[PDB]
Every structure is written in C-alpha cells, then in structure tokens.
Design a protein around this ligand. Structure first.
Ligand SMILES: COc1cc(Nc2nc3cccc(-c4c(F)cccc4OC)c3o2)cc(OC)c1OC
Length: 302
C-alpha cells in the first residue's frame, strides 16, 4: 500500500489556555501549579497543572511522566485523581489534573501530630480500595507517604502522583528500582531483591503506624541507618494502640513478602476482612457514602 502524504488537523491543548494562579508544591519530577481554564466548555474551571521542564535531557523523568500519563488514562476509580489533559511543547510536558481543594494529609497530620483510630481506619479503607484497583491493572504504587494523599472538598482521599509507580508487574515479573521515600520502603525494596504489589502493603503499614503514633516505625539517624533498620524490622509497639491495630501492623510488617497480609491468594480481601476494618461497609465506602471524619460578617441591623 502506497502512503498518503497528508496530515490530520486538530485543535491542540496548549499551556496558554490555562491561567497560572499559584504554585501548589513539588511533585515527583516537577512543580504543580493551580491553574484556571481560560477557554472552551470547561472555561473558569480550576485544575492542578504538573510541568516537567528540560524534558529532552531528563530522559528518566520523561519515560516516567509518559508512564504516569498512561496509568492516569487507564484508571477509573473514586479515590484516584482524574487526568483532564496531557500535552507538550519543546522541552516541556504538562499534565492537567483535578485540583484537590482539601490539601494533603501530611498538612493535617503535622497539625494534629496523630489521628484517632476512627480517622486512620477511614483513610486506610479508601486507600486500600485505590491500591487494589492499581494492583488489578498490574501497577505497584510504591510512593505511599502522607504528601501523596490528597483530600477533596468533602474530605475523601485521592492518590495523584504516579511518577515513581511501576506498570506491567504480573505473573512472575518483579521491579528492581530503588525509588520513593526510604522510611516507607518494604525490606525487599531496600535489599534490591525484587518487589511486586505486596511492597505496597508494607508501605500501607508504615503509613498506618505514622498516622496512629505521629512517628515512623523504622528510622535511623540518616537514610543508610533507616535502610538497615527496615531490614531488621525490630518494631517497638506503642501501648496506646488497640489490639486490632497491633494485629494489622504485625500482619503487614512481615519481611518475607509472600507471608505479608494482602499477599495471599485472596489479595486485598485479607486486608478488608481484618478485625481493624470490621465496622467498614466497603460498598458504601466505594460509593463515597461514608462521611469523612474531617471536612477540609460583623454588620448587624435587624
Ligand atoms: C500540596 O499542597 C496543596 C495541594 C492542593 N491540591 C492539589 N491537587 C493536586 C492534584 C495533583 C497533584 C497535586 C500535588 C501538588 F499540588 C503538590 C505536590 C504534590 C502533589 O500531589 C502529590 C495536587 O495538589 C491544595 C492545597 O491547598 C488547598 C495545597 O496546599 C497548598
């Protein structure tokens, strides 16, 4: 067949269609900005714009930005951020995502020091459904940390940053990269022996421990000491934690990933049916029908 030398025409989304309002923070590979759509059907809509600079030279950040885009296009879940646009210019990549009005969980955690078990149960329950959705698509999230847990105006969670995630992890395939925040890494991630979706359940345990106590379970004076402390996994259990919380933590903190809660044949069901989550109606939770525990004039002349 002879090639028809003609070009398809399309009106392309450009960064000029989004008014820059302020810098929201720093994502895995670039800055995130609050922007407002100028034109089209979604005019006046607020979004979060993630920008990757000098994209042509930053080859590893570029391949992961493309993977992040691909993950976001594939996912359809209540607790996972929606991607609205993805486009590029010379040396710049852009992702236009939902703007989460409630800020991140780290800001709330730092202000409160620690959360009640009722609050932790809520956050982890929505997170377990989001993680399981990613696992069903062959994805390892890998970058759990409270900075990556965003809240909407209602107080429900959203996972938003997939820059450090891993795709195509199914059957006997393992990932070997050493990326993410060290304090949340599973032992198999730290010792470079290969990791799968079960590494996310160790991270889920770290996040749980931090939310309940205000501190990290395995941490040393520097990143190298934290690494060897994760490999030893000698956990000092705070005595204000309930028996249900202590059971879940010990079942998640299994150094052998094959023996970790959520790694058995029932997958996420092993976590969903744990006593710590016994008051959770998982169907109502997925339907966003569970009230979040936290939701993020003087003149008088009658
Ligand atoms: C990180 O701090 C804030 C973030 C938001 N909202 C928000 N929606 C987002 C959608 C995608 C990404 C981010 C994000 C970000 F904006 C900065 C750093 C990391 C991020 O995600 C892990 C998002 O952040 C909203 C805020 O206040 C209303 C924040 O406090 C300044």
């Amino acid at each position: 067949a002879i090639t028809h030398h003609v070009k398809e025409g399309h009106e392309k989304a450009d960064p000029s269609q989004f008014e820059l309002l302020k810098v929201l923070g720093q994502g895995s590979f670039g800055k995130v900005f609050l922007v407002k759509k100028i034109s089209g059907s979604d005019a006046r809509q607020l979004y979060a714009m993630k920008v990757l600079k000098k994209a042509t030279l930053k080859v590893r950040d570029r391949v992961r930005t493309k993977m992040e885009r691909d993950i976001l296009v594939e996912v359809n879940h209540p607790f996972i951020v929606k991607l609205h646009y993805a486009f590029q210019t010379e040396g710049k990549l852009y992702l236009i995502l939902d703007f989460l009005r409630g800020g991140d969980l780290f800001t709330r955690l730092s202000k409160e020091v620690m959360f009640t078990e009722e609050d932790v149960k809520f956050y982890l329950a929505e997170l377990a459904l989001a993680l399981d959705h990613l696992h069903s698509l062959g994805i390892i999230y890998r970058d759990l940390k409270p900075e990556n847990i965003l809240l909407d105006e209602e107080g429900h969670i959203k996972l938003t940053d997939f820059g450090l995630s891993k795709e195509s992890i199914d059957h006997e395939k393992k990932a070997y990269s050493f990326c993410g925040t060290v304090e949340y890494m599973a032992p198999e991630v730290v010792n470079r022996r290969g990791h799968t979706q079960s590494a996310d359940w160790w991270s889920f345990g770290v996040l749980m421990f931090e939310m309940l106590t205000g501190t990290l379970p395995f941490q040393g004076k520097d990143r190298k000491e934290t690494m060897t402390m994760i490999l030893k996994a000698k956990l000092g259990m705070p005595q204000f934690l309930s028996p249900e919380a202590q059971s879940l933590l010990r079942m998640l903190f299994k150094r052998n990933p094959a023996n970790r809660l959520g790694a058995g044949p029932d997958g996420v069901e092993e976590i969903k049916r744990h006593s710590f989550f016994s008051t959770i109606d998982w169907n109502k939770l997925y339907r966003r029908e569970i009230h979040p525990p936290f939701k993020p004039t003087f003149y008088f002349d009658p």
